[PDB]
Enzyme design. Structure first.
Site, PDB file in Angstrom:
ATOM      1  N   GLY A 182    -102.868   1.091  -0.405  1.00  0.00           N
ATOM      2  CA  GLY A 182    -103.340   0.012  -1.259  1.00  0.00           C
ATOM      3  C   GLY A 182    -102.202  -0.625  -2.046  1.00  0.00           C
ATOM      4  CB  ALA A 183     -98.726  -1.509  -1.009  1.00  0.00           C
ATOM      5  CE1 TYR A 225    -103.576  -7.417 -12.657  1.00  0.00           C
ATOM      6  CE2 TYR A 225    -103.568  -5.176 -13.565  1.00  0.00           C
ATOM      7  CZ  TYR A 225    -103.376  -6.543 -13.720  1.00  0.00           C
ATOM      8  OH  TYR A 225    -102.987  -7.049 -14.947  1.00  0.00           O
ATOM      9  NE  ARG A 245    -108.865  -2.368   9.199  1.00  0.00           N
ATOM     10  CZ  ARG A 245    -109.887  -3.237   9.142  1.00  0.00           C
ATOM     11  NH1 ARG A 245    -109.704  -4.561   9.042  1.00  0.00           N
ATOM     12  NH2 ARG A 245    -111.132  -2.758   9.195  1.00  0.00           N
ATOM     13  CE  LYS A 302    -111.613   4.741 -10.309  1.00  0.00           C
ATOM     14  NZ  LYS A 302    -110.511   3.962 -10.816  1.00  0.00           N
ATOM     15  NE  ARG A 342    -109.639  12.562 -12.382  1.00  0.00           N
ATOM     16  CZ  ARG A 342    -109.285  12.667 -13.668  1.00  0.00           C
ATOM     17  NH1 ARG A 342    -109.593  13.752 -14.370  1.00  0.00           N
ATOM     18  NH2 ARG A 342    -108.650  11.659 -14.272  1.00  0.00           N
TER      19      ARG A 342
END
Lengths: 307, 307
Positions: free
Chosen positions: A10-11, A14, A35, A133, A137
């Protein structure tokens, strides 16, 4: 410029674009998973990748919805840093299965970079966003994968620049709406600084299987203090409105998706004070006490620019 | 006679409450799938539920995740309407398996109540959001569930009371920011009216396996015509600012979740004009011409309360 091979999933997001930049700047071999996409339909993105391979980043062509491209990209690296969007927070389960199957990964950073989801007092819809999230974890932990959870708090370029005002792109010179009493302390961190401290934690053993907080001293203040620092700089008084917790919750209930998620995260942060109302325990560590060497932009510095 | 029994899933949500109300007001047997009525937490919810109990609704116990509660709930009804929030839309696939097992259900309305996701020219993240709803439509169709998709366009309580300005609450008296050229036509519908027209459709043969569009003639206008109508009401002209598509796309890219979803949905509606830039086909039906009966609140009537 250390040694380890890092993979960014996800480079172009934001915060991902800042974590990618600093990966290159503290000189690691940076891998970017990408992708296949139609570039006119995704312009600013294509252009951001253009500039990452121009800076020196090594592009791996993949998707988290492709275990074979994931396991391959993961074989290849030491630490995996995911910075994916909310739409695929739950799909990081794929990165865990691949991380599990490979065995060579030294550290996995999942897509966190906001509030610490195991220490929030959130209301819906924010309560459910955070629980997705928290569940990743527990899945990282169940696999036994080495991890660091970065709890970077409030993005300066979203919340500081707006003076925590829902619509704005610059600090208001007329008026502010302060939620709750305005005395809950918040911490704002400039996005480029979030990227640096994240990359400094990658190989450090003090951050192995820890949550890393960014509770930066010069950057921790309440909205009352922030409005007052800016009334000083802009040498005038802002008109203020005070919205109690009860009126914030009515607002949330009477707002549709996605703006209700906004107002509910802002209740957790600005009403409950969820970034500063708990102590960093045995399993936590703070980035300024760990990296006292990094010079971060203070709130006074970032605000003096808009004056 | 024998009226159709409606089970409503998501009855206390932003729109579900207005649908539940109208099911009760148009004299249908109304059943509401509720899990709990939380002790201190969402007591707004609890007092909403109570209001509907007092008005005639039957609380059915269970959720989208207890598969047996769902099968038992959908067997005792004729029509199922889902108005779950965006975070659970993907999980309505649970509702499809329960409806599919029961055989009994004459009509399923998935949680739509916006843009026709099958006639959208969206960019990310809105593109991905629109597609989890398109993914559910296909699955209804795949298992051959009778269905009605309600494409009710802009909620007046969010978009019309603000004059499409993010930041909400009341129409501006000074300036307005317009995305694109301001000529893309949009349909604003009051939530009460969306409740009405949805229930008018549950029994009709005309809406069977159709997409019902609310393109209410007195409420279909462009943002330039909206500003002009309001300008006339308060006898004063506002300043305008037009943001091109290039900078709208750039802002989405440079804004974090959830605010980037907000801006990408305003791009679809106000820059692409996806609410009016296509023709209602052979499997679409329009609500005011179907129900000339419903004396819906017009934009002028709605906006008059803000003068």
């Amino acid at each position: 410029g250390s040694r380890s091979r890092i993979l960014l999933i996800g480079a172009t997001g934001y915060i991902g674009r800042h974590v990618a930049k600093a990966s290159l700047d503290l000189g690691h071999p940076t891998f970017l998973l990408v992708r296949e996409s139609t570039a006119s339909s995704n312009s600013e993105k294509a252009q951001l990748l253009e500039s990452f391979k121009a800076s020196g980043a090594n592009i791996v062509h993949g998707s988290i919805d492709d275990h074979a491209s994931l396991v391959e990209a993961v074989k290849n690296v030491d630490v995996v840093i995911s910075t994916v969007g909310s739409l695929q927070i739950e799909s990081q389960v794929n990165i865990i299965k691949a991380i599990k199957e490979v065995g060579t990964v030294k550290r996995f950073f999942p897509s966190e970079f906001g509030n610490d989801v195991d220490n929030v007092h959130a209301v819906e819809p924010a309560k459910s966003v955070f629980e997705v999230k928290a569940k990743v974890r527990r899945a990282i932990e169940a696999e036994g994968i080495p991890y660091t959870y970065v709890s970077s708090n409030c993005f300066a370029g979203y919340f500081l620049r707006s003076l925590a005002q829902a619509g704005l792109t610059a600090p208001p010179r007329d008026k502010v709406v302060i939620l709750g009493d305005g005395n809950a302390r918040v911490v704002f961190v400039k996005e480029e600084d979030i990227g640096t401290f994240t990359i400094k934690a990658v190989d450090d053993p003090r951050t192995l299987n820890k949550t890393l907080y960014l509770r930066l001293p010069a950057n921790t203040l309440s909205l009352n203090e922030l409005v007052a620092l800016w009334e000083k700089k802009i040498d005038k008084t802002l008109e203020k409105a005070y919205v109690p917790e009860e009126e914030v919750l009515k607002l949330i209930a009477d707002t549709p998706f996605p703006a209700n998620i906004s107002i509910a995260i802002s209740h957790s942060i600005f009403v409950k004070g969820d970034q500063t109302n708990f102590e960093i325990g045995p399993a936590g560590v703070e980035a300024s006490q760990l990296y006292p060497d990094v010079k971060y932009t203070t709130v006074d510095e970032y605000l003096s620019n808009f004056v």
